Ligand SMILES: Nc1ncnc2c1nc(Br)n2[C@@H]1O[C@H](CO)[C@@H](O)[C@H]1O
């Protein structure tokens with residue numbers, strides 16, 4: 001009579017990392033890629049022989065900086081002249097060119113100079129997320145919900161749909177990232193009455209706070225605030241500067257001019273930063289870091305917390321601003337939701353919990369997975385085609 005329908009998927013198409021989920025058997029499964037990773041870098045690399053996407057692209061970035069594209073989400077649906085674009089271009093090793101006041105990334109690929117629109121780079125990331133899902137389900141996937149930041153305008157939203165269409169996906173809906181995080185906790189299934197929800201999203205490079213009101217499952221964005229210059233990479237930078245100074249004190253050598261040694265130090269610092277979220281101290285062990293000198297050291301969570309203290313405290317300024325814009329007092333917030341890997345930092349959690357006078361934070365769904373989780377819940381709802389009984 002009627003063939004079984006393929007599952008629809010939920011994709012968090014992130015600036016630095018993307019995540020895919022599927023709602024089946026009354027629950028969400030966040031799908032790991034073929035290297036066992038539950039999140040995939042939003043990176044695309046180009047060589048004379050291949051196009052690499054995800055972990056394979058990010059793992060070769062050091063020696064191929066000019067032809068490895070990342071951060072396409074910062075360009076999507078924007079004009080080349082936009083001041084945001086012009087400032088961001090100074091930090092990127094790849095070329096961004098002007099094509100009719102529209103930015104394009106220009107790379108060396110398969111023996112030629114090729115330029116791509118940001119939606120084309122995002123479609124490559126979406127193709128990888130679709131393949132990750134099909135490897136788990138064991139059949140082709142057609143339908144998807146894709147999330148975007150709440151501040152995305154019409155052009156940015158249409159360019160995200162265009163990326164989905166290029167990837168061969170049927171885009172069921174473009175939904176806001178804070179709305180998807182709320183859906184992940186079922187905050188739209190609590191019945192009649194208004195609920196005020198604050199989403200605290202601390203990423204690799206940016207910080208976003210959103211205030212939503214939910215009434216009978218209807219969402220309204222009440223306020224957005226944030227800091228474009230605050231994220232996980234800034235905490236890594238503080239550790240890098242600390243260990244460069246430490247190497248100077250201990251061995252009377254400045255390593256800061258050997259890119260390989262700085263990169264090896266930063267890679268170790270980011271892993272040490274992650275360990276410090278679960279442990280009170282972490283070891284740093286690098287062999288032949290500079291001039292054949294082995295760098296075997298440690299850092300306590302207390303010292304890391306002191307190094308980033310001003311950065312962690314500054315997350316409360318957009319929270320207070322968002323509350324003023326929404327015209328709400330902190331006691332009026334019913335639910336607090338954490339989004340982004342950087343929210344696992346115990347001190348970040350303590351500062352926010354203390355600001356909301358000891359309130360519990362919703363952090364049970366992995367914060368780097370909550371957005372894809374909610375997108376997967378929505379995708380399963382949107383494909384239902386139930387016919388009413390008499
Ligand atoms: N457990 C963790 N504790 C502290 N930070 C973390 C953790 N896990 C992740 Br993921 N991050 C950081 O989140 C950002 C995601 O783009 C990057 O800066 C990661 O370093």
Ligand SMILES: [Mg+2]
Pocket residue numbers: 014015177203340371
């Ligand atoms: Mg995100």
